[PDB]
């Protein structure tokens, strides 16, 4: 894996490690891609815990994965907010963002895409005190 | 007038457009909705998918906001609501394109209007059938838009209409997220103003006078920023009363009725009314075959403009 | 005519002052905007008025959008963003 | 690839890659470093950056892991170690690009070998100089690079060498991530692994024998899929040993010493030996200007594969 890591291949090495039947070759804390968020409305940690449980038991009451899906961090069970909106069409965001560094806006691949390439701007859609240029 | 065939076979009841005014949605005396969509290289309106969605004829459907995804409310005399959400991940025009979310089974009565709140109100819902109760419903669940609880239950009319007479029942919301909440809700002959009060029930806010008849439709003119509501009313004379309502116990803020102007153009019953993006044109359609446009000219007063005949 | 209206009124309306008329106006607008799906044009609208926010001091004085990123830290369970 | 001439002013001394091969750190005796670019466009090297590092000879260098940023370590004959982190900001060739983080002035000797430790292990580095006492210096917290804590002062020697000019270090780390963690200290003429036991202290764990002469350099062999471990050491009498090292699980595992094999095939002084990443091929270079390729044949015995001449 490090000497897939040496040139620029990835991807394999990430189909290598995904169905690893050793499941501590590269690093020992577990999901290091794990990215835990706090409420933009009430302040407190996006777990998600409830919904999570009452899915688990929905999904085991009846004979199907798909309403495990519903499952996410787009929306807040402490404060009941609904859904994280983009910073370009405002439309609801759930299954790939496109996070803006210096102002922390979510935003889809197509939206931030073609205002950043396109429209070829250099400022968030949303409006901000600085440059979030490229 | 280019036509095109929706493909119902039976009567069309309601069409309506969605927020971005490329999608429009029709349902029909043969339990079905389709959705058309309107591609931009072609410019001709094509069928996005048709399904079955009640037992009895659809008689009011009605988009949700954009931000909250893509929800079809649809009212049919079977005395239920039933909520359609979309999943891209479906082939068009095969039925599957379009699935369920809920069904609403409070109303015992058969539903004749159903429209959706403005997006700054949460993800509410109207309902009004022949049993004069005023249902609103909330999604307070933001995991699963399945769980739809019922917050309002308003009484407009004392006893339901009877069997054998007509009845019409109509609804509008009021599009401005800077006035409190409200609700055009017409009875047989009456015409209400709600609004939502500081102990979180709705309360009777004002009446719009006249309306000798059965009221067909209700629109609230979109709030544009002018200081002055406008709802426009076709009824079953051949009157279209336009009230410029102006805003300032257990109320927010009162608000008082003036009736703007009143036109007998249509020597008839006006049976649709509606508004523009701005409220600018108010189209109106009658039993003379005409459908009309209405413009406010030099002064507040609606003057006629063109009359388009079918 | 709100377009006008918003785009005049966004030169020195929270900047000088601040009143409810130019917020619905800033609103109708930028509704209409997401109506007719000019997402971009809305983008401009927004980035000039903070741009036009700006006193002669430098303090912003726009309602801008607010933030939707709070990352956790794996290394010690706290707000990177407070 | 093409050969490309350097604009050092003196003998170059050290080149070591980076991790993904695209970059060449290039230390000299003039107090330079030289680190180029593999630019995908014409197949050329372009230099990115060229600064003085320290006030004398620049013995070793060594690029730390991609995951915790563009570090290089430099020891030089000023007795100190000096981090440099990239700044991207700088335009290149501008000698302000490579910013210094920490300087490790703690050897009374001057400092022959760095060497950073395996990516599993943490920002780790390691010293060894003429002081005689191999020294291994921790971030501990790798959040802030500008705090390095002394964590081991392990003395290699018996005694420190009198004959402070005749002397010569190096070290080499082990690469092997499941098996316990592995040094090799060449002093002055011995060769001795270190391991870390339950106490958290290096112990010898096993001696490489031989070596009648200085050692010049010292290379662990990646051994992917192996049943044993391969050292390369080169001398100034000019023999090429490698030593078939094998584990079997105080310690946690004892280690036993083959010399597998033996090659004076440099009528001279051998200065570098390097493994490939396969552990199969390995590199040696004299002072004739002759670089010789070994690979193991059909027996457990070496061969010289070819011969480069710089003509
Ligand atoms: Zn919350
Ligand atoms: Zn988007
Ligand atoms: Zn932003």
């Given at each position: 894996l490090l000497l897939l890591h040496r040139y620029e291949l990835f991807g394999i090495a990430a189909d290598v490690l995904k169905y690893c039947p050793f499941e501590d070759i590269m690093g020992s804390e577990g999901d290091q891609s794990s990215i835990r968020l706090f409420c933009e409305r009430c302040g407190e940690l996006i777990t998600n815990e409830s919904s999570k449980e009452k899915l688990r038991a929905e999904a085991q009451q009846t004979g199907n994965k798909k309403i495990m899906d519903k499952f996410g961090y787009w929306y807040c069970d402490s404060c009941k907010k609904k859904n994280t909106s983009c910073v370009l069409c405002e439309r609801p965001l759930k299954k790939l963002t496109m996070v803006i560094l210096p102002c922390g806006h979510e935003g889809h691949f197509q939206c931030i895409q073609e205002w950043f390439l396109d429209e070829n701007e250099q400022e968030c859609p949303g409006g901000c005190p600085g440059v979030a240029f490229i | 007038m280019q036509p095109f065939d929706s493909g119902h076979d039976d009567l069309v009841h309601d069409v309506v457009y969605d927020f971005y005014g490329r999608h429009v949605a029709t349902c029909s005396s043969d339990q079905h909705i389709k959705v058309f969509k309107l591609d931009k290289d072609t410019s001709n309106w094509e069928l996005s998918d048709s399904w079955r969605a009640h037992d009895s004829s659809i008689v009011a459907i009605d988009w949700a906001s954009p931000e909250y995804g893509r929800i079809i409310a649809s009212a049919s005399y079977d005395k239920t609501v039933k909520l359609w959400e979309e999943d891209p991940d479906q082939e068009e025009c095969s039925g599957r394109r379009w699935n369920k979310l809920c069904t609403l089974n409070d109303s015992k009565g058969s539903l004749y209007s159903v429209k959706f709140a403005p997006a700054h109100l949460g993800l509410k819902l109207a309902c009004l059938g022949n049993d004069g109760i005023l249902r609103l419903y909330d999604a307070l669940e933001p995991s699963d838009l399945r769980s739809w609880t019922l917050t309002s239950e308003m009484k407009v009319l004392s006893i339901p209409p009877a069997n054998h007479l007509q009845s019409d029942f109509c609804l509008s919301w009021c599009?401005?997220?800077?006035?409190?909440e409200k609700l055009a809700v017409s009875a047989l002959e009456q015409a209400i103003i709600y609004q939502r009060g500081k102990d979180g029930k709705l309360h009777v806010a004002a009446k719009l006078p006249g309306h000798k008849s059965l009221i067909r439709s209700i629109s609230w003119a979109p709030?544009?920023?002018?200081?002055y509501q406008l709802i426009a009313t076709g009824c079953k004379d051949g009157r279209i009363r336009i009230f410029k309502i102006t805003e300032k116990a257990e109320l927010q803020s009162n608000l008082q009725v003036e009736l703007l102007s009143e036109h007998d153009d249509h020597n008839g019953e006006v049976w649709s009314v509606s508004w523009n993006l701005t409220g600018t044109i108010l189209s109106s359609a009658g039993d003379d075959g005409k459908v009309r446009l209405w413009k406010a000219t030099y002064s507040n007063e609606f003057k006629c403009m063109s009359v388009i005949t079918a | 005519d709100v377009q006008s209206a918003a785009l005049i009124s966004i030169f020195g309306s929270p900047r000088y002052f601040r009143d409810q008329r130019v917020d619905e106006w800033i609103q109708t607008y930028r509704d209409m905007l997401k109506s007719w799906e000019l997402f971009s044009m809305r983008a401009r609208f927004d980035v000039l008025r903070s741009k036009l926010s700006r006193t002669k001091t430098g303090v912003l004085t726009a309602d801008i959008k607010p933030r939707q990123i709070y990352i956790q830290c794996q290394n010690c369970k706290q707000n990177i963003n407070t």
């Open positions: - | 599009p401005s997220r800077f006035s409190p709030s544009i920023g002018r200081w | -």
